[PDB]
Amino acid sequence: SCTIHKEDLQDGLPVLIPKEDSLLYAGSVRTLQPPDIYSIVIEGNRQRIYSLEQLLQEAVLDVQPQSSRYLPPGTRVCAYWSQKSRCLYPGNVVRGADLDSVLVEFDDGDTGHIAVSNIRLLPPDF
């Protein structure tokens, strides 16, 4: 469920990583010669080196759903809020009153419709 396993940490793996602002950013895993440390190219693009353990705890797979079919109300997601920002905001899909958009209530208190292409899945207990 988008939770990362050690075996999958390979060069080019697409991930989302939290920064010190409680928001998520899309990144890519770059393996290094030493085992169990990785550089994450974080979207300009800058890098930060992570241990294996910190990646397992903090990062999630970057997974874009194809449609709203399996994003019913209650589904945990994050989302691009604007084209002008590369941060993703965590929240949950909520029931409105559409195969290509969902209504999301964000942890920060905002609510808005999000195009499915701007949704990324999250682990339920993230």
Binding site: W81, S82, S85, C87, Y89, D108, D110, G112
Partner: peptide, 6 residues
């Protein structure tokens, strides 16, 4: 971190 307004 300011956020775009809707």
């Amino acid at each position: 971190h300011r956020k775009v307004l809707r």
